[PDB]
Amino acid sequence: KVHIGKVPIMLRSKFCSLRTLDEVDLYKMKECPYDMGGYFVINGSEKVLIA
DNA sequence: GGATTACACCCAAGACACCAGGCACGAGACAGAAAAAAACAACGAAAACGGCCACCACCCAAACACACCAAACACAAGA
């Protein structure tokens, strides 16, 4: 399995680690339940792709 | 073919080259070019055979004449 690179992950998508959590664990992970995702985190900065 | 398309002000966010073939030096091989020799042209010397004048005799050319034929004024005919 040659490592060919790292692909940034869209938050609240099927590959995010915040997809399987419930509201309780979300609270423990410092995540706002109102936050809907849809953006990326690059160097700690939230980025959104404009259509 | 270029060149220009409002004015002022505020804030945030990322990068501030990395990596790959050419110059120098680093050494071989046919080609860019140089040296030589052997079959290429000619000329000097000897050999004898082809070329020139005689001698020569038979075959073609000219003269004589034959009969034969082509031809040209004109007496006659003719429209």
Kindly state the DSSP code that residue A42 receives in the 8-state scheme.
Answer: E
Q: Are A33 and A23 contacting, i.e. CB atoms less than 8 angstroms apart?
A: yes
- In strand B, the nucleotides that come within 7 Å of a protein beta carbon are 13-15
CA–C1' gap, A44 and B9, in angstroms: 30
Which nucleotide has the least CA–C1' distance to A44?
B13
Which nucleotide has the least CA–C1' distance to A47?
B13
The vertex-A23 CA angle with A30 and A12, nearest 5°, equals 75
Taking the C-alpha atoms of residue A48 and residue A22, their distance in angstroms, rounded to an integer, is 24
Taking the C-alpha atoms of residue A39 and residue A48, their distance in angstroms, rounded to an integer, is 5
- Helix, strand, coil: what percent of chain A each, to 5? 10, 10, 75
3-state secondary structure of A23: helix
CA–C1' gap, A3 and B18, in angstroms: 22
Method used to obtain the model: cryo-EM
Q: How far is CA A43 from CA A8, A35, A40, A46, A47, in A?
A: 11, 19, 10, 9, 10
